[PDB]
Amino acid sequence: QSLRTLQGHQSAVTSLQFNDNIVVSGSDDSTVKVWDIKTGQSLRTLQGHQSAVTSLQFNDNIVVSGSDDSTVKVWDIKTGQSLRTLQGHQSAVTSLQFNDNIVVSGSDDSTVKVWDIKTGQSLRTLQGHQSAVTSLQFNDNIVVSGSDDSTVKVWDIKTGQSLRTLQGHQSAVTSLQFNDNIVVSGSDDSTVKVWDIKTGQSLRTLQGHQSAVTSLQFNDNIVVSGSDDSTVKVWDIKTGQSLRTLQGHQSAVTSLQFNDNIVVSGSDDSTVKVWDIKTGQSLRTLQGHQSAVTSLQFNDNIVVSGSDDSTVKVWDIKG
């Protein structure tokens, strides 16, 4: 059942995150909105970007947002005030991640930038990709970036040096995750690849989707991938074998998340589906959005979805 509909953005929701009773959403209308999940009402609107918001992350103190206007902005989540604009990228910011030390952003300009979050200054520019950076993740030592140039690169965050270049996809990398010595990447070439970060070599290629891979998540046992072919697939990460194809969506799967009980997927067909991961069967379809679902997050018995219809919805996972 739909619990709340968060109305107020004037164009498509591109990105969202939620934590306890706060939802933060980014939109093509160039704003970020902060919402109270209890009453489904807007708390404040973060105004200042000059084009679409593509990406965001927030914590207890701040929101960090990336835009088509080529900036990253740091905001105070409680006052709504813009604190710092990180200027430097020459084209749209597509992805970002931050912690207490650094902001890391990827851009259509083919670079990844590392910014000192405390001083608000650029620390280094990671140069080497030949086309747009689409996706990134970092930890302690390492940034991992995926690109329209069909490669994944692994970088030394402290020196800016390229450590590994993961070559093998035949088209753009759309999505990636890494954990310990494993990178998993999804591509427009319709495959997922599993890579060894130690040697920068591919471990196996997960073949089976009939169109681009848009999204993935993995754990110790399995990879779950969503595709333009409208399916989600569950794979064994060690054998590379397809285990289950989740069929039901009527158009491209744009987003997904899973745990030990369920897979939750969002689609261009305007629905969110909840699947029993153990039985491989659909449990329910969340109907109500009037256009494509672009983004989702779930936590315990709550799903939050963003849509091209300009709303965010909050759903009861078990009903």
User: Tokens at residue 301, please?
Assistant: 């018995």
Method in brief: X-ray
User: Tokens at residue 66, please?
Assistant: 């990336």
In whole angstroms, give the CA distance from residue 33 to residue 44. 6
In whole angstroms, give the CA distance from residue 32 to residue 90. 22
In whole angstroms, give the CA distance from residue 214 to residue 174. 6
| Strand blocks (E) in 47-111 | 53-58, 62-67, 72-76, 82-86, 93-98, 102-107
In whole angstroms, give the CA distance from residue 75 to residue 57. 11
In whole angstroms, give the CA distance from residue 289 to residue 60. 29
- What DSSP string describes 178-214? EETTEEEEEETTS-EEEEETTTTEEEEEE---SS-EE
In whole angstroms, give the CA distance from residue 269 to residue 285. 11
In whole angstroms, give the CA distance from residue 14 to residue 10. 12
Q: How far, CA to CA in Å, does 161 sit from each of 112, 127, 156, 164, 232?
A: 12, 9, 5, 9, 36
Amino acid present at 280: G
Q: Are 17 and 56 in contact (CB under 8 A)?
A: yes
Nearest to 56 by CA among 87, 81, 77: 77
In whole angstroms, give the CA distance from residue 71 to residue 107. 10
Residue 124 has a CB neighbour count (10 Å cut-off) of 17
